[PDB]
Amino acid sequence: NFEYARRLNGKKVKIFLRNGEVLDAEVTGVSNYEIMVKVGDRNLLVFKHAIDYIEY
Amino acid sequence: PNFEYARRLNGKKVKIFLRNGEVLDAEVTGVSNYEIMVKVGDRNLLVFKHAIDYIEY
């Protein structure tokens, strides 16, 4: 049941999305399948399936 | 092992960024484990979550 992604809550990370976009993202919440982020003044729900990797 | 944030989007205006590069300016009309129902203008869509990259809300 363990996941490392939960430990990224509160960090500001780079999310490398599957299409080539990169989000500079403050992580505000993590669920089994989603990562909630703030990107500047935007709030996003990011699906983990759309992420390739995260630099932190 | 069950909680999801997407359920809280029900009833809200959102921007859905799809894996194909399309962007939907939508109102959410329902959310299930694997689907998000939306209105886009006059159109009614069932959107599979697997086809979504992210949602601005």
Next chain:
Amino acid sequence: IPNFEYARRLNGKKVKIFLRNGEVLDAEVTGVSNYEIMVKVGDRNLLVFKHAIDYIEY
């Protein structure tokens, strides 16, 4: 509510299925399982995997 899904509510309806490959199916839905949607497209019978669908207009 285990296994609630909106897709099976499209059973018996005329829909437009937008596939991940860019194709759009003008379809009549004849069955919906957990992972598949059965459709008629003109004279053709198709088994469509839900994972290959982006969205459905109805």
Next chain:
Amino acid sequence: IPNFEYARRLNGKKVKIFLRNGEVLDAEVTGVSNYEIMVKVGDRNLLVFKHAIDYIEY
């Protein structure tokens, strides 16, 4: 998830498998598991993963 798949109805049948890579397999189905479809394409035996299939015409 109940024990039902429409893909099982295609066992032993001639079908066209439309793959996510754009290929279309003219296939005879020789087995169906939860995640795979076993086929004969000409003289070739293939194990096809369902996740790689967009739809099947039958």
Next chain:
Amino acid sequence: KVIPNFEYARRLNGKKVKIFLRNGEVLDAEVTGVSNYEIMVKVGDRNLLVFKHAIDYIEY
């Protein structure tokens, strides 16, 4: 526990196969192990762990 139509990939263990990957790469491989989600192979001198989700089909 005896479910014939559960997983065919496990029967590939120890066999020569051609693996067609989702990006168009093709592996001329020998299977050295199979798990629920992975296939272990030798390709030439190289040892690879291949995720099944990255495989389109396998010729055997």
Next chain:
Amino acid sequence: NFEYARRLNGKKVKIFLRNGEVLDAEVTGVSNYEIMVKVGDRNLLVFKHAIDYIEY
């Protein structure tokens, strides 16, 4: 339950991602769905769904 990827913990491997990228990666942790790696001085969380294969 069993997975081979867990046995790569502590190894330096080449991770071939679905976008065509290769990571020269030291594996520092493995969960059901993630592989934690060091790539040079960068720390990454890599999702297994984004990996095609790993050379080890």
